[PDB]
Design a protein around this ligand. Structure first.
Ligand SMILES: *C(=O)c1ccc(S(N)(=O)=O)cc1
Ligand SMILES: *C(=O)c1ccc(S(N)(=O)=O)cc1
Ligand SMILES: [Zn+2]
Ligand SMILES: [Zn+2]
Ligand SMILES: [Zn+2]
Ligand SMILES: [Zn+2]
Ligand SMILES: [Zn+2]
Ligand SMILES: [Zn+2]
Ligand SMILES: [Zn+2]
Ligand SMILES: [Zn+2]
Ligand SMILES: [Zn+2]
Ligand SMILES: [Zn+2]
Ligand SMILES: [Zn+2]
Ligand SMILES: [Zn+2]
Ligand SMILES: [Zn+2]
Ligand SMILES: [Zn+2]
Ligand SMILES: [Zn+2]
Lengths: 257, 257
């Protein structure tokens, strides 16, 4: 099974998931010299007021907060997107140290972590069908840096002891994903992939300019999760990020000047 | 994710897995009026003397006992097979009640459960390559009925509380799969598929005429496993069987009169 170790990590994924060497792999470095303002980009519309969180789970790679996606209760519209994209889950990638953790980079700067809000195009009926289409998914990416506590993160951090090991979950209701947003929704966009196997080239990436602050205490809780199952030797869940992949022919567009 | 429930069960698999309606799907009903004796069928050769069991796991569908398959320590030869097929794992399918559980049926009779010993053709180098070939796999199917205890099953039943939930596994060494066999190796054979997604049409089915007896105590322990993971509400692992699929143009051959 794939992971982030010496023998099963990003360098090895291509052996089991051939698309790992595809033409539209994520993440990428965002060079602010070439990622030019596009005045044709319509404003981004985030509609999270009625978001219904269901569960949180350790899947052995990250932790996922899952949402009720049977209705348009939490949707992304506008920006680069045609149609309605329903929030299915969010998760983070983070480092062993503050100087690393983000998948995307900005002028090669790595952040402490990266938040991925995962949405699928309602045009396709379910998530499984959406991942087979270039316009199937929209992932909202938000950078994390270490400073002040993020109050909206506290409810997540406070349940992580209940899902320390792989295959554990917990009921996780009334979580407001608006409390994880920065002030600006100014963004970069480019066509890309899932950053974990199966690495499918189905994602419109929307990466926010403005990082959120989390406390070193909040990021320390992330680093105390385990990759391993209960009863196995401890492997700390850290450095669960894929490095920058070749931009190849793609255009990164900025929503801002 | 696929399963055995109202919305994700065998009736619905075709929506996600088009091969579910393929030309060689398993299981099938074995009608003893049309499944005729074939005098050309060689005796079956089961060579399990050096079988090396490694681990047992709850994968959320059944429980698998895994074998060291790096050598010809546990192989199926003869009968309808060209070449050597290495034992990789066995698992069962079973019901909520004694009147159902088997995948294959004989003259429409369902048994309480069915054991699948899974082997792959050494011609193809590994299991992953073997599942892509029509002659890649050989599954030995054995029917379970409720009567006397199967002594050879007790070591399996005794470890099931330790793998109650999905993802759980345990060391499971020195298990002798010969202790799960009936006295007669008389069999039916036909070309078919995996009975679970991905339902690949890669299997020579060898189904034994003679069922084994298990105790009602032994089958009760099967019914106490969980489909769910740790932290989810209990869903009993019962009725993890696919019903009879259309025979279409296939010939079922009997090794016996
Ligand atoms: C699977 O549902 C999946 C895999 C990767 C990602 S990412 N890291 O590209 O946001 C999302 C979902
Ligand atoms: C997977 O390796 C797999 C799936 C199904 C079966 S079955 N039920 O056809 O014996 C065996 C192996
Ligand atoms: Zn290579
Ligand atoms: Zn590999
Ligand atoms: Zn530059
Ligand atoms: Zn709102
Ligand atoms: Zn995984
Ligand atoms: Zn859903
Ligand atoms: Zn991600
Ligand atoms: Zn702005
Ligand atoms: Zn536990
Ligand atoms: Zn249908
Ligand atoms: Zn489906
Ligand atoms: Zn589907
Ligand atoms: Zn008949
Ligand atoms: Zn599964
Ligand atoms: Zn089976």
């Amino acid at each position: 099974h794939w992971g982030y170790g010496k023998h099963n990590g990003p360098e090895h994924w291509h052996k089991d998931f051939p698309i790992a060497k595809g033409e539209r792999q994520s993440p990428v470095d965002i060079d602010t010299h070439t990622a030019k303002y596009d005045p044709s980009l319509k404003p981004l519309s985030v509609s999270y007021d009625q978001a219904t969180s269901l569960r949180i789970l350790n899947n052995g790679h990250a932790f996922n907060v899952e949402f009720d996606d049977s209705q348009d209760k939490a949707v992304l519209k506008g920006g680069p997107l045609d149609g309605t994209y329903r929030l299915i889950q969010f998760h983070f990638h983070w480092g062993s140290l503050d100087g690393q953790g983000s998948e995307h980079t900005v002028d090669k700067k790595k952040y402490a972590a990266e938040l991925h809000l995962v949405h699928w195009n309602t045009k396709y009926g379910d998530f499984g069908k959406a991942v087979q289409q270039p316009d199937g998914l929209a992932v909202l990416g938000i950078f994390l840096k270490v400073g002040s506590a993020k109050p909206g993160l506290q409810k997540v951090v406070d349940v992580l002891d209940s899902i320390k090991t792989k295959g554990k979950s917990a009921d996780f209701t009334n979580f407001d994903p608006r409390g994880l947003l920065p002030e600006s929704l100014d963004y970069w966009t480019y066509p890309g992939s899932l950053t974990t196997p199966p690495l499918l080239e189905c994602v419109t990436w929307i990466v926010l300019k403005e990082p959120i602050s989390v406390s070193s205490e909040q990021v320390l809780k992330f680093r105390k999760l385990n990759f391993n199952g209960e009863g196995e030797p401890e492997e700390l869940m850290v450095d669960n990020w894929r490095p920058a992949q070749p931009l190849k022919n793609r255009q990164i567009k900025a929503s801002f000047k």
